[PDB]
């Protein structure tokens, strides 16, 4: 199929450099171009620069012209963005995009997009989450519905994966976006609403995985009788 | 550099309705260098319109673009469920200096739905570790606007809570929200009554969920 495939997530200390790759398949990359655009969570798209694949001719945005390099390897149909002297404000998802080309003919605009690469820039050090139960009780039982969950607290970096009952429980799950705390660590809750009558006959276990800290936690959430 | 300003910030519309999205440029932009993109949560942008009015390959007829100079419009003649997304304009004048608008979110308008409200005291396990998180959950409400206030022994709290909200649900068009009050174990043990007070259009008066520390 026609696609751009980007390299995996990056976690970098301030002052370092990051290199993100963008692999083209299913179209005539030699006729094409690659732009780089970034997006911080809940913020607008920001243009970094672009390269024409044939010539290798580059053009960078004012903000990045002293610390970005865009390159391509035509033999591997790959483009790269190298961003140096990283700062916390560089934390964003970075996207590559190309005009579709078939032989010499190309789309006017950038219609093929990579899946994005998460880049975190922080002074914070790798830390595994503390996983605490949010136990169902009379205070979390509304009509015939109970709420229960797991608090996944004080981890770095993103992401954590949270499943319920090894992926068997998906309906009614809310895994909230992580909040960055003043400490530089992340915290989130994963909750599920269930029929209150299920609490006696169905076990609820939150499965928390944090690969960077080698953390695997399976927390059984026990109902309270009060 | 050229600044693009989009209006409105959020459009709340029923499926089947017409959507009109505005993009104003701080400087005169030629119609040849204005694009529109669609973006859904956790997805890359999708090109809709190039050169102000040209549909990208395979883009449906219901998407159209108009304008030039400092004023551009994207129209969606009849909103389909798959059209609820954020929309960005972009100017690409010259070889550099390309900029995007801040985006317009086109959100599904549904009937008012009051949240169900749930409160969770700190776990015994967390208190042992020296911190106390009190969690207030709002389940499956509409619209998005909700006021969640923390009261500790009837005192309004400030600067010690954080909210997190889900994306609008693809099937029931509701939101869910967590509010977390974070205290030192010491500060938690000084007070008795912990209350989450929820104000929402679906509630004729605010709903309070509360507990006495150590009772359950």
Numbering used by the authors:
A (entry chain H): 1 to 226
B (entry chain L): 1 to 216
Sentences from the paper on this structure:
Severe acute respiratory syndrome coronavirus 2 (SARS-CoV-2) infection is initiated by the trimeric spike protein that decorates the virus and binds the ACE2 receptor. SARS-CoV-2 infection is initiated upon attachment of the viral transmembrane spike (S) glycoprotein via a receptor-binding motif (RBM) to angiotensin-converting enzyme 2 (ACE2), leading to membrane fusion and entry into host cells. As for all coronaviruses, SARS-CoV-2 S is the main target of neutralizing antibodies (Abs) and a focus of vaccine design and therapeutic targeting efforts. Two mAbs, S2E12 and S2M11, stood out for their high neutralization activity against authentic SARS-CoV-2 virus and two different SARS-CoV-2 S pseudotyped viruses [using either murine leukemia virus (MLV) or vesicular stomatitis virus (VSV) backbones].
The S2E12 heavy chain uses VH1-58*01, D2-15*01, and JH3*02 genes, whereas S2M11 derives from VH1-2*02, D3-3*01, and JH4*02 genes. The heavy-chain variable gene nucleotide sequence germline identity is 96.53% for S2M11 and 97.6% for S2E12, showing a low level of somatic hypermutation for these two mAbs. The concave S2E12 paratope recognizes the convex RBM tip through electrostatic and van der Waals interactions. Specifically, S2E12 utilizes the heavy-chain complementary-determining regions (CDRs) 1 to 3 and the light-chain CDR1 and CDR3, respectively, accounting for two-thirds and one-third of the paratope buried surface area, to recognize residues 455 to 458 and 473 to 493 of the SARS-CoV-2 RBD. Nearly all the S2E12 contacts with the RBD are mediated by germline-encoded residues with only one out of five heavy-chain (G109) and one out of four light-chain (G94) mutated residues contributing to the paratope.
